[PDB]
Amino acid sequence: GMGEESILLKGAVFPLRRQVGNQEKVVGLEQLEALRRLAERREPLILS
Amino acid sequence: MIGMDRRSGLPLSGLAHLKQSVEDILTTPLGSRRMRPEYGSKLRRMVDMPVSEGWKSAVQAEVARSLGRWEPRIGLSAVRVVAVVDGRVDLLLSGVFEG
Amino acid sequence: MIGMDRRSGLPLSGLAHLKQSVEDILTTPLGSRRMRPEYGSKLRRMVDMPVSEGWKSAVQAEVARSLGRWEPRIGLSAVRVVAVVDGRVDLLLSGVFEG
């Protein structure tokens, strides 16, 4: 066979650093829960 | 695989069919086909948006999705802005051939 | 879902029924309903308490409980004090719509 191929993404979200160019809008608290909502679709994803 | 040309009705097979297979992906919007709603590209949604450096990486990420669905015999390499005239941006769709 | 209005008896369905569904939660105390003791809000217990910054977070935490029980088609966003006159605090109950 081929076996399991996995990709693991580390990192950090700082949800008070303002968006680039000071767009009067910060990085949100919602912006990791969007990863959760997109993961309860029981659905594969294309990495690009 | 041997198909027919869109205009002029001539059956062309090898690599001219390969290029019109890509341009049926890129220029059809989603849901325009009959009984095939997950066909086409979101490039018509990218029409008349400002050419930023995030617009470029969103076109590379969307051509790769739409060609990944209905064009398995093409491995996409890169999409590059090569010129800008008033409104008319033009993209060198480069990709290796598989299958 | 189609229900009837509390006053005037008229059957209203879409979103006016959504708002009176919330205000039956917020203004009924617990145990006031017949054979449904775990219905309503503790907001009547929060009536005539001093408006501190812990009173605000205890109302957000209690509206979210009481709407989480008997209002699944509303996702609560925030509860904010927007004005204070003598005794009359007023709260902008903001929430997204689901279901």
Next chain:
Amino acid sequence: SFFHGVTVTNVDIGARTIALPASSVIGLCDVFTPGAQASAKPNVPVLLTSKKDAAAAFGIGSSIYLACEAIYNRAQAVIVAVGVETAETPEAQASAVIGGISAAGERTGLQALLDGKSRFNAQPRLLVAPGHSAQQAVATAMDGLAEKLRAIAILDGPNSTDEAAVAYAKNFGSKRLFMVDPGVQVWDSATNAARNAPASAYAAGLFAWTDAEYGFWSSPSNKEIKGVTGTSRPVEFLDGDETCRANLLNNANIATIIRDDGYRLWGNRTLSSDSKWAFVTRVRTMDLVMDAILAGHKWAVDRGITKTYVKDVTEGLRAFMRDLKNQGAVINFEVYADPDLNSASQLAQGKVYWNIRFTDVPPAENPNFRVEVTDQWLTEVL
């Protein structure tokens, strides 16, 4: 008489005139009926934020509210709404909208939109006369008021056929006009049929939705219209430069609602004679950076000219325009004080010059795709 329990309130409470996004404020002029239900004098401006403000200041059946609903269905916009009393003669009805200084010291009609600032901190950026822009006398009035206001006027053609609107666009070319000719129709609750809306206010709500959610530098064409059904004309569209009624209007510098009969606007070029100023994003980013330059640098009219003062704002603008460059509003720029025209003869007069040179982002209205295939470097098959 107070109350001591928990209560529901369905009326407005708080003030939202604090934010005031300066790029999306809209000037609005149409007829209404100044009864007892409409608590606004006719020829004065009034600040609007929500549909409750339009309900309180104007009548529900009045066509001010029909244009205020057309904007507030899409964007959380700010409207400076002036009213006009409805007349009998339509050539005299257009005379009421243009206004003038016919009063003692009061501006009436469209000219009261110049009094947006000094009343409600709204220097209007979007001029709409819904229905009263198929007449040329008001479209010329909205033309000449635009460069006084540094805005763009969203006028609309007649609801006749295409060459009636192409020839109506040939009377202009004045860089400030954005025409959307198919008057789109909307579903009604009372009529239970299809209405007839002039579709100039729907493009104003789409511009206020664009510049606040996508930025003013983004092209406001390919985006969704809400509160909409089919158009008054079925306007076909294809790909490949055909005889389509989409490519006919766009090449005549006219925008149009195109796909799925009401779904999206389509077209970004303005009524301009110059190919330099063809896009609206060339015109919008011209005026909405140079009044965002001023917002924040309002101290440049005082703090008189010392040695550091010319040097204080020449990287006061360079540090602000690099904030515009990093958020994508422009691409690379240069800000420098004027070497030759700055002199001590007119520095005592108060005049001191700075040179701004920026290029802006182009909107990708026509992406081409030269597809090419290979294996390593060349076409191995042929």
Next chain:
Amino acid sequence: MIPQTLTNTNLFIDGVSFAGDVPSLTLPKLAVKTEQYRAGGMDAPVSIDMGLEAMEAKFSTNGARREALNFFGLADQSAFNGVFRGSFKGQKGASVPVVATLRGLLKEVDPGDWKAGEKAEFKYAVAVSYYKLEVDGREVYEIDPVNGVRAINGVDQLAGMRNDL
């Protein structure tokens, strides 16, 4: 700006004045806790405002002051208060009263090397639980650790972080 600098200082502990005692001060080092944020695409790591460090105010005393040694290790915090004062003179004599009202817990007492001829020193240390710096008469810093009020120039910066979310 005219050149100014410290010329004299003073210290209060619970009202009484150490008007002939203290040779040294140290106001607490205000330092923001920075986390190095470098990520995909960005080149150099930025540092992010993510809270303050531990404030600690040293002061020193040459004699056995019962008023200073009274407040070591008490069962209640903020029983020690302390007020640190400075005077910055300027070039034209315009002296500027820098007063720093802290309300911490007294943390450390070390009478050091008691040599015979050499003078002795009682170094102190204060685990600061409240800090408030005033430059002339206006309140520059007001640091509440236990409360959510970090007031820089009289406006709360922690309150502005809650309105942004």
Next chain:
Amino acid sequence: MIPQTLTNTNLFIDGVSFAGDVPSLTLPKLAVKTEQYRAGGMDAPVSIDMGLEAMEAKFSTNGARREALNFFGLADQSAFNGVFRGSFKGQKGASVPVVATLRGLLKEVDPGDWKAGEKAEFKYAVAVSYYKLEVDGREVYEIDPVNGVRAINGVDQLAGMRNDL
């Protein structure tokens, strides 16, 4: 080349000049993050250009400057800007204006040992989020951490790394 060296300096914070205040500066240490690459066959480990280190700009002040203490720990980054200036005279009097426009976040304030006779010092530290050095009038460095533009001598070096791949 004629011998040049620093003779005088200056400092701006948000427009106002500290024309009699600052005794010391420190421009941020530009240092590339090096990873030791020794491999099979090669003898000595090479160091590879793999991003910059944390930029941090110290400056110092002898008096209580309200303009400098205003910008500590603000809820918005790049509210502090700061401009550091130097003047390098040469041997023939040709003075060369070295100006370094940074736009960081103010990181650390420590009023040190307030001894009585000794002058006091307010050391500052700036978590640099933007750096731009100009030697005479020409732009040598332009360091965007948060953007992908590391401009050395006016040409972006990070853009050249993307064209190579």
Next chain:
Amino acid sequence: TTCRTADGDMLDSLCYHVYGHLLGCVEATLDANPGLADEQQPFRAGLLISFPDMP
């Protein structure tokens, strides 16, 4: 679940937006709709489709 069209809304798109798939979902819509297929497939602005459950 009655929906109202626009002048360009189409049947296989609509019952893909409602149901989520199109296998057995268009003719079940055409079954419980009198005179829907007789109308032209680019729909007019004011015709009503009652989408049934379990397509």
